Design a protein around this ligand. Structure first.
Ligand SMILES: [Ca+2]
Ligand SMILES: [Ca+2]
Ligand SMILES: [Ca+2]
Ligand SMILES: [Ca+2]
Ligand SMILES: [Ca+2]
Ligand SMILES: [Cl-]
Ligand SMILES: [Cl-]
Ligand SMILES: [Cl-]
Ligand SMILES: [Cl-]
Ligand SMILES: [Cl-]
Ligand SMILES: [Cl-]
Ligand SMILES: [Cl-]
Ligand SMILES: [Cl-]
Ligand SMILES: [Cl-]
Ligand SMILES: [Cl-]
Lengths: 365, 365, 365, 365, 365
């Protein structure tokens, strides 16, 4: 992704004007190849009309250009563009909201499952690995950058996400479906076996663990559904025959005709259509928002970095459930042990952020 | 459904332009018969005006065409179209969000309900069948492709979704209502009988199972409500009068009149209305989005494939609760048993996805 | 309600065109009386201008009609209409989402509360009646068709929804407020009395029942709030002044003036304003959507049928908790007892719905 | 609030037309003082132009009026008005959705907490008073009509909402913050003391009570946040410099100039701007929706009546937890004791509401 | 933040007009530097055209100004502005909705964890400090005003939010990631140690505490995600090109040309563009809403005051869990001990707020 939050913290004179000089993941990079084609077509038509066409055909071209001018309307195109990229943006955010994080699960696995020895460490590590395996399995079927990293299920065994026995057992199901639901069923059976044996104290804690697992299952299912069902092709094909039948009209009709005929609209010849290039930029960078956000798991500059979250999770979970169990800092008296109103100091550079407490909107009256 | 997610992963030069050459489930297939009628009417009127009408009646037709030209406005038509297909799209997505999946229920049935023998296997299989039966019963009343597959309740018995005893019992209720609520009541009684007998350990687990069943009941009820209550006919009949009273005005008024009268607008005769055909495509493919999404359980190309999810569920649930109970892969030491920061390898084709961890937006300052 | 879902399943040639010939609950019935008034006023003014007015006053009328022609604008009227009926539609759907159904409660009452004899049957029937009573009490205060059916609280006693003792006790509260909250308090006390006595096994089950009751209480409160607080009168009176100050301008200004003055816009006299009648239909059927959905508990054709859901619930609940307790079909071996991949047959008429399982969007690459 | 739901139940001929003759809480009352100023300014300018100005200055005024006529545009003003009052309306509804009602708490306090004597009655009454106290304390800091009723914390003691001991204890905290969070902490300690002593049977019930209290705490916090943070002043100041720079242009520019100069637009002199007054009404009653809903806890006619809900709650809760505990109507056999399909009678005035049960949309096919 | 709720409680004559004379956090302060540049450029171009340019070049400038006048359109610019600041505003509100408050956690920590001595006080204080530490750690990585207050982790130790032992232990993890997830794992282990030892009575209460902690973990994660992923740069750069390519057209084209050429539009020379300055204000104060709300954790006048909520929380939590445990006011008989319908008095200034109870919308009929 592209992060520019630190550059727009305050509304200064040039906060938004300085973002127009950005190259990576911007308008100038996304619509660089669609501008050359437009310019080449425009100048080819201009040259053909200026020298190739004869005097009699010049009048026909002039009348055709006059005709192809009442069809340049900006309301219908600005409506589809804008009712389309609100749905696209909402889908883009909801796709990120469903990314699984084992943060509410590693806490409970570290706490509830007891025992500080082997067969406790092994059990906790297996329990926390069975969820990262499911997350990797679902992400491999939707993310191109992750599929490139793990092109086959033997690569998972090589990378340590799997085990030889697990890989052998996963192949003995015989079902012609995606196998991203199997580790979630392994987790429940292993947790029940752990409970039968005195490692989990209570059925209350066991039910809490099951409830935590079901949410991750639901989130993975939602990601799979979003990938499977996309915005209908009839809706997608309407916005690109609304923005491609507008610059086509512009090409023949936004042409500097001969100024000897004294038209009410055309009386000056500029070489470059400065006010048409700006319209092209504004009306194409709006469509390239949808063209980029319609699948957030690609290899763009504004696509989710899924190869980093499956690396952070593997380290954080294994450190939380193995090396940080029953190991907490010493318990000591605080600084404000006998103070009823603690007053932490303010630094010199942040003395202007001091404020009084809000006490209701009717306090003054 | 039509899946094109793999073709729009990246925003390249021709990602959206190459989707305009698609036939299955597209504009060219949906409005293929509504274009021939328009063309035939246009050309019939043109021929009649050109030869059938006399000189005196030509002036009347010309004045009528001039009159039928100030009523071609694009804002009121672009507002209803756009405030209608946002409601239609939201309803279309919410209808899929309520599809029942027994994924959170097969896990708990496989885990909690104990016993590895007959009368345990039978109990688990019956418990998991009583939910697929309810899902099939609700889908048969709303999906045309499923009703065609199971036209009568004897077909369910033949297909194995039901049993002779259950089919005989379901007919002895005598209520003139839909019977999609009965298996959910059978499930609770069977689960209570299982608890009374030592197959379920705790009332906590029993309550968890009941809580899981109630959610599926709510989702089935929501699907039934969505099917029962549709968008009001007065709202549907308004958008069909605003897009049919626009091409009617176009037919008489977007006609190439005689160029010997020297009108300010019409001075050239083209045979084919190229810029009217494009408007027709853009303004009719927008209405055919609603025309297609107003009932997602039909036999279109962009309608939910409900005949595949009732086949996947039956296999997956029965494999999870019967052949995968108390059968988990061996417990073994991991690859990173004594490593605090695991570093899974990167493939050669995905070495450009390496990134540093994000450490807050205030890190640099 | 009006159901037309079966007629719009597929996007065929005449799916939306055939709905324009519907009478019940449609435009032609909702704005039948508002069209006669408009036509009568238009023709009266036309006749007065054509014969009553003198030659000198004809010029004044002509100038007034010219003046009342620049105020016919379509954007401001199409904005309020469209930002109003999105709020109206969302409120209309949220009002249905809060309808209480005792489907998650009859299941638990049938399962948890034990005992197959008198004093068990009586207890279960009373527990399930105390919720239908509250639903009827809340619906009687907001639905006209239900108030007409039960104009007084003695009618509830006559109809069997109540009892003489309960009716006598409810009158002995002495509070000048609505009494739709009393059965919910009776339910909790009766359930606690049932638990004290061995009819409910566990406090876990008791708490589950209380949690189920609280949701119905919340839904009834939400229905009461929606009925109590309506869309502000200032917002409602603004859309009624924007659509009544537009046809008023149309009446004087969309008139076929004398064609002897050679105006740039008016040069032909048609008897009937065909393109004004269509505008009237389109701009009045849009307001009559809000006029119909602003209170969904009336006696319209697109209003909720509340008299049927209080009849279905009474039968279904009493059959579930009384005659279907501890009575389930025999437990038998399934058809696919020793088959790992069941393959239910496909009928001849639905052989085109066979599809392969989706296996991720990265499978081909 | 203003309730007109009973007058718009059905879509008859004059349902919406009869609401234009309402005075209380309407357009004519909200914008009564802004119309006199506009009329006075318009007529003063008209008189000055007609008599005070000389012949040479009349031409300058005429040219200025012509210039101030191309800036009367209706799209930019109809966009901000309409994107502002959607946010205002959603905030207005979400502010009511967070009003605390102790209906789910009085039920559980009446049921779970046992004992029918003193020290049980006292405990239940104190527990139910500790929540109404918190609701009153939060409402007093945001509602003007409630602050006027309880201007000081001694008024709460006088009115019975508090006690001398509690008022003395609340003053001994020494924190310079709002004290609307203290009764919620008193509730938990009192409930734990009640459990330690045998008045609450189970820790399950104790946890249920704590869960119920936390929701009310969250709702009160949300109300406080909504009051504290308002719509940004820059957003508010943009809509009122876009509707005040439109009637300013109207004042000089919608003036009936001298008809002796033969302008294409102005050729007739009417005394009163009938079509400008209507525009003023439509464009000012739209802004006065936001002006009224931007703070729903004022003293308007469309503002929440918070002084009645703190009076209903105090009576209902104290009747439920004190006089209605372990006191339920006699248990008797129902009317349909041995009937499987009860058929409640239909009244003569509601015989047209009889309908058949819906049996799926695929039943006919 | 800026609070003006007390000034807009009622819809009086000058409620919204008096907010146009506000300086702090307003239009005049936010766009003060962008107005001087525009004025300087306008007057420089005007002077150059009036004196520097020759007679022949004046005609070229005049024709260029005429050309740059058909590209001043208001619909495309009013659509992006308005579809952008709805997403920005929704994100701004959702960012505040995720602010952690330990209000539901201090209650349970004060109630459930028993013991009134040392090793009970110490345990409760540590448990409540471990959550404020996590909140401070997450806020320090996203808020500039908090980072300025705590530029290093030794400042936290100095300010009392931390301890030497905890600071030493946190440095011994060796993970190159943000460490805002560590106190949440310390909390669970400390709570389990407290349970093992008789300080927490029940596993039910322990599970309740874990459930309460998980919600705060989720909220902190959501804040981190919102900070990490921002609105795409292509979407931000499109609205900035559409409002900077409009005043550029205004500069050359909204110029008072020579009135000796008798143009249909320009016939008068005013020194100051009064109707262009207002347009600039309206169309730039709309963009400065997004420029200000795109990062609500800056140092603006309409940005969240995060330095006050980390000071209020530290005092409130430590007072609730330490000095207010098992210390509640005396239990006494209420004022309405033997009254069934309490009637609290009304003050003289609020006697107009008396209202009758609402009894349904069908009461009158
Ligand atoms: Ca992409
Ligand atoms: Ca369909
Ligand atoms: Ca109605
Ligand atoms: Ca107000
Ligand atoms: Ca900011
Ligand atoms: Cl999380
Ligand atoms: Cl150009
Ligand atoms: Cl699921
Ligand atoms: Cl054409
Ligand atoms: Cl339900
Ligand atoms: Cl007409
Ligand atoms: Cl409630
Ligand atoms: Cl006027
Ligand atoms: Cl809170
Ligand atoms: Cl100007």
């Amino acid at each position: 992704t592209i992060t520019y939050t630190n550059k727009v913290a305050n509304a200064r004179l040039g906060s938004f004007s300085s973002l127009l000089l950005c190259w990576r993941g911007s308008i100038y990079k996304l619509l660089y190849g669609e501008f050359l084609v437009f310019i080449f077509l425009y100048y080819s038509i201009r040259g053909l009309y200026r020298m190739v066409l004869s005097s009699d055909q010049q009048l026909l071209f002039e009348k055709l250009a006059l005709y192809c001018d009442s069809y340049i309307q900006l309301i219908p195109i600005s409506f589809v563009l804008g009712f389309y990229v609100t749905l696209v943006v909402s889908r883009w955010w909801s796709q990120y909201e469903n990314l699984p994080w084992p943060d509410r699960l590693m806490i409970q696995v570290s706490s509830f499952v007891e025992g500080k020895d082997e067969e406790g460490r092994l059990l906790r590590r297996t329990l926390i690995r069975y969820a990262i395996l499911g997350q990797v399995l679902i992400l491999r079927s939707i993310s191109t950058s992750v599929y490139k990293r793990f092109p086959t299920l033997h690569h998972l065994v090589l990378a340590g996400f799997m085990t030889h026995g697990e890989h052998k057992q996963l192949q003995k199901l015989g079902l012609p479906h995606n196998t991203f639901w199997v580790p979630w069923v392994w987790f429940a059976n292993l947790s029940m076996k752990a409970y039968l044996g005195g490692r989990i104290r209570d059925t209350v804690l066991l039910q809490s663990l099951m409830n935590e697992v079901c949410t991750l299952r639901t989130q993975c299912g939602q990601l799979y559904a979003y990938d499977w069902i996309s915005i209908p092709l009839v809706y997608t094909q309407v916005v690109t025959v609304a923005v491609y039948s507008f610059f086509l009209a512009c090409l023949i009709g936004r042409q500097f005709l001969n100024p000897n005929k004294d038209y009410p609209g055309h009386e000056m010849d500029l070489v470059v259509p400065v006010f048409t290039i700006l319209q092209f930029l504004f009306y194409m960078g709006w469509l390239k928002v949808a063209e980029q956000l319609i699948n957030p798991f690609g290899e763009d500059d504004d696509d989710f970095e899924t190869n980093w979250i499956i690396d952070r999770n593997l380290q954080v979970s294994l450190l939380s459930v193995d090396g940080m169990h029953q190991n907490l800092p010493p318990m000591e008296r605080d600084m404000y042990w006998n103070e009823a109103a603690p007053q932490p100091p303010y630094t010199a550079a942040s003395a202007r952020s001091r404020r009084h407490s809000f006490m209701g909107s009717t306090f003054n009256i």
